[PDB]
Amino acid sequence: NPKAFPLADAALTQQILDVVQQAANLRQLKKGANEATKTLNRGISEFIIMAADCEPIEILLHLPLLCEDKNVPYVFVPSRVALGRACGVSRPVIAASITTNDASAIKTQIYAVKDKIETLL
Amino acid sequence: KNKGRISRYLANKCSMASRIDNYSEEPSNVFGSVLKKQVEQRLEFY
Amino acid sequence: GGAKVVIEPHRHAGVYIARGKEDLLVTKNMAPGESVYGEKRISVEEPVPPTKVEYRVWNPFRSKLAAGIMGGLDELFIAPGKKVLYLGAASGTSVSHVSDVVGPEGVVYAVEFSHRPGRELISMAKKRPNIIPIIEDARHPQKYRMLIGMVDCVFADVAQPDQARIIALNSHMFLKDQGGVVISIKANCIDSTVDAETVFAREVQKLREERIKPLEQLTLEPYERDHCIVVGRYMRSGLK
Amino acid sequence: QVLIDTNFINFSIQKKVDIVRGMMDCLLAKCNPLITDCVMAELEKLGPKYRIALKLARDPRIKRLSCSHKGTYADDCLVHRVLQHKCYIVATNDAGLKQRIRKIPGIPLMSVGGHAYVIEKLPDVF
Amino acid sequence: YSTPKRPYESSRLDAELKLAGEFGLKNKKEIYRISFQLSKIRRAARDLLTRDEKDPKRLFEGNALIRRLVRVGVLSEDKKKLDYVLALKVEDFLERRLQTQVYKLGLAKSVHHARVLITQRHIAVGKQIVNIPSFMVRLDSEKHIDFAPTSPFGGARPGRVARRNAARKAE
Amino acid sequence: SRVKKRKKYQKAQKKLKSVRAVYSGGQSGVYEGEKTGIKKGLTRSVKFK
Amino acid sequence: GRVFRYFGDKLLISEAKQSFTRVGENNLTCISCFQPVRLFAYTVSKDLQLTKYDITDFSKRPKKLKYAKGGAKYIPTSKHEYENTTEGHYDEILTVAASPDGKYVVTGGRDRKLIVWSTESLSPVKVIPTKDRRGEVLSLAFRKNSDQLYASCADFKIRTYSINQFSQLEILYGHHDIVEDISALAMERCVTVGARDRTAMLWKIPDETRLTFRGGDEPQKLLRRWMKEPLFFCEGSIDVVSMVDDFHFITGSDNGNICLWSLAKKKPIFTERIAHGILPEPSFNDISGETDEELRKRQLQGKKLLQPFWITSLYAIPYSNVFISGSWSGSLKVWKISDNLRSFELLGELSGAKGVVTKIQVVESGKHGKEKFRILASIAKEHRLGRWIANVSGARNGIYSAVIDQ
RNA sequence: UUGCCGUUGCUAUGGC
RNA sequence: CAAAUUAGUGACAAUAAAUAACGAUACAG
Ligand SMILES: [Zn+2]
């Protein structure tokens, strides 16, 4: 067991990154570590994606404890660069969060990814 | 101002440093050193 | 924020209501002078001079058991002298409130499997001495059968699909006859292909198949969508 | 998932409707039929005239619940376990049980009528 | 379309109340039309289940039915089984219409704002301005629902109210 | 015909707050309190059989 | 037109004259060239400057001629999407395209404009906005020997223009992510690739119809195929194209794939999995923050977070037997496609280009059996769309020209 | 051979 | 109670849309 433990393999990683890109287009993604912990303590979050290769790792390992407290799925993508590119911004991000919405046109996709990463976790 | 936003820069770097320091099991000093270098570069830029 | 409330005992023993212009579910504080997860506190001066004892606000949006209490449960089994086996003590959020409801003469065994929540559980159980933190998987009660003996109520805030088997194993090991079984069922975490009433009906059927007679269920709807608390008692002979 | 009782089974065999196939072409959905132990007790107590009905209720496609009470009053058991949970269709032909079930709200009621099953309080049948 | 069996029971009235209010429908005929053809769809899928495995009808019409249901978009890509066609229902069908989709994509503030945007022609999927609200967008036309370039909520020249107010304020 | 069903659904989902307790969306800001009262005598939970 | 220039193994490879002319522009982004039937080239940067070069002095480095630098002066005074008719670029010029006849260069970027400049003076003759808010252009390609431009705009849209008439022909829709690259030949077909939908489409533009080609490599079946006796996996995002001839093309992916596709097969004909290597893993002094090397090694999880270089430039010489791939591995690769047109193979490398290769294309010289080409490649230290790129390992913002012979 | 700056060549490199 | 034909008159409520959308402020209990 490493610190960044529940890492996803390549198929789950691309499923995660595709729904991250679609939520970023639909304004349902809060990107960055302290925005992610803000939306996590506010409770509007469906799952959090941490990238398992940033330059420290505890910098985002603070978030699994928060997700565990509030029972939110969390998953580790192995590329901060690809995560930022999926988020649609011109920088690497290390953590992102899918906020809850019921007037959301990708709710089935988000729920399927939640089920996959929760059976992983 | 500059004096008002160095507080915010030092705040989020200090939060980063405390996360490193808490969740690492037996910590080093090198990332506190790098963040000190970053915040002195930011204050010397002004 | 600096206002004044009146503390009043609830129907449930060990928990209180602070009436103001908005009334608060409130428990006594076992470790006076600090907050555990940032809740607000109430300090009364009860009457050697009078002593400042204090109270903690139980937040129903951060506690399934408080959502159940203030939705209205006919009988909690968490009582001021009891022993509670908390399963899924995910941090010290609700375990602190269960601990000081149970009081100094009763014991809360807080079982958790992850390790950073366990570190926070041990640092909270320092200042609350009536908490025995047990860092172990609840799916194998034999791995901690040596540390716990003869609890009076089990509370289950685990969020796993093998919930009813975990509850049944821990009850058959450590619960006594006609003891309390309080379950917080989360429909979406059990399974999301069926609806919430189907999964609650199946979980209640699983409990009575493992001979825990359900007395009561409550949906706890304004605080959590598609949750439930099922309160039962461990009948052990004759659900009929 | 549909709770069956004894006169629904008797009328199914009297009208020559299969249980799971009649349920499927009534609702146009996949059905799970449930025989409670009190309905099964009532079919067994009906005697050796109703052997055909008893061993058609003994069917691996028909799943079965485990009621936990004294006595074998299936109408009480069906009414209690449906007004507790509201995730059940009640398939019945008793006039009294039909009136009880259609007085408690949100519970669809299925019944043998004609040569196939009918469903009433389920608002999405087509 | 066709009317239901018992059209006036209270469960059906509260059903149609929730459907018309949650999807901004004008009358019962929207629900009855989409439910009539859904009834045909899963009445067919029931017969495809009542025949056996390795039946030619079942194999070919089953994968044909689930592939064109996936391409309409009411069925996801991974559930390629034929019992999910039975689990399908009416709001899975009228979540696919253009009024619902415009509101969910957030070009409008409610389903009624979406209906008036569509009927005032500010919405074009792909190339063509669609102007009826009950359109049943597909899984490939799901992402090209945007504001029409002939419209002031796109980038075009502003309408008559805005330009008349600009002219009168220039006077 | 459309605005009538818009305004009899708004009436219906305002009546639904009376019969059930509707999940409004969770905790908005700071937990202020129950804002309406706490009854210690009423138990609104479904007993079995 | 099929492949009529079979010369892959023929010309020399290993001893090219490689001149890396470094220029003082932050993050060069595109390269456009020109040959009549003197040769000019064009570069453009993230510093909002277009720069004309002469390149026809073949044995030496290119020669700067003329700047054209937009800036903050060209921000429109409206913030209104159809009066975007200014005369310069105020944000992030992403692509240039020279005319096949050479009267104009046409460029555009994230300011959702197409500015068409004259060649002889680098002056903006005409401005055509893309009339909506997200209408950033990402790739431009003229169809060969023509005056018709195909721009690929991030509205999931492809706009077409006639430049000498200043008119727009046809807008054609149908990708599912942003249309990251475009490619065309003398035919009125076109080939576009959208980024994350992992499909490449080709468009009959008069008919306004398309042929789609999805990817579809899965590490389950691929690791089983190796398990019959291994660090290779699924696909991120198809990124770059070049139409080699009028029956085949080649796609550059996000996991370092280069794939060869026909006009008659949905699934690709040939793959090449790792085309530029796998990236150097982050160091133990920059992963963890513990003290001991054992825990800082445990925070690498073995091989699980090694990510491949992604091919960010691909250029097929039209109708020829050879294409060139480039990323930030430092070394361009040259591949030739086999004469049966069902595979390609690495010939050699061009290792004098330190940085990301934001553009590759070649310039011809010599006759039908004896030929020499200069491969231009725009080199930056930052990807042409966003930043995202750490470990800038000795990169410089320049033009890597190579002179290949025989 | 460039935005600066260093080695420079009497042309190539490397730090921002 | 459809006596006009010498592309047009001569509907059998069969067919998809509209009759409004979005804000601000005030005053009540
Ligand atoms: Zn029974």
Short mmCIF file of C-alpha atoms in Angstrom, two decimals, chain D residues 106-108 119-126, chain E residues 4 6 9-16 19 31-32 35 42 90:
data_model
loop_
_atom_site.label_atom_id
_atom_site.label_comp_id
_atom_site.label_asym_id
_atom_site.label_seq_id
_atom_site.Cartn_x
_atom_site.Cartn_y
_atom_site.Cartn_z
CA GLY D 106 -49.31 4.27 -3.66
CA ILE D 107 -49.80 0.51 -3.88
CA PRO D 108 -50.57 -1.02 -7.29
CA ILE D 119 -53.25 -3.89 -13.03
CA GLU D 120 -54.86 -0.75 -11.69
CA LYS D 121 -52.93 1.64 -9.43
CA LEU D 122 -49.71 1.56 -11.45
CA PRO D 123 -49.75 4.72 -13.58
CA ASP D 124 -47.12 3.61 -16.11
CA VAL D 125 -48.44 0.53 -17.91
CA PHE D 126 -48.04 1.63 -21.51
CA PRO E 4 -54.66 4.85 -21.44
CA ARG E 6 -58.14 3.98 -16.76
CA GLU E 9 -57.27 7.45 -11.52
CA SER E 10 -55.55 9.64 -8.96
CA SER E 11 -52.15 8.00 -9.36
CA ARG E 12 -52.33 8.78 -13.07
CA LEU E 13 -53.37 12.37 -12.39
CA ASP E 14 -50.52 12.97 -9.95
CA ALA E 15 -48.22 11.17 -12.41
CA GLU E 16 -49.15 13.50 -15.25
CA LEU E 19 -44.40 14.84 -15.55
CA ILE E 31 -46.98 11.97 -22.29
CA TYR E 32 -49.57 9.88 -24.09
CA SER E 35 -45.79 6.48 -23.80
CA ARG E 42 -41.24 -2.72 -24.86
CA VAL E 90 -41.41 7.31 -20.09
#
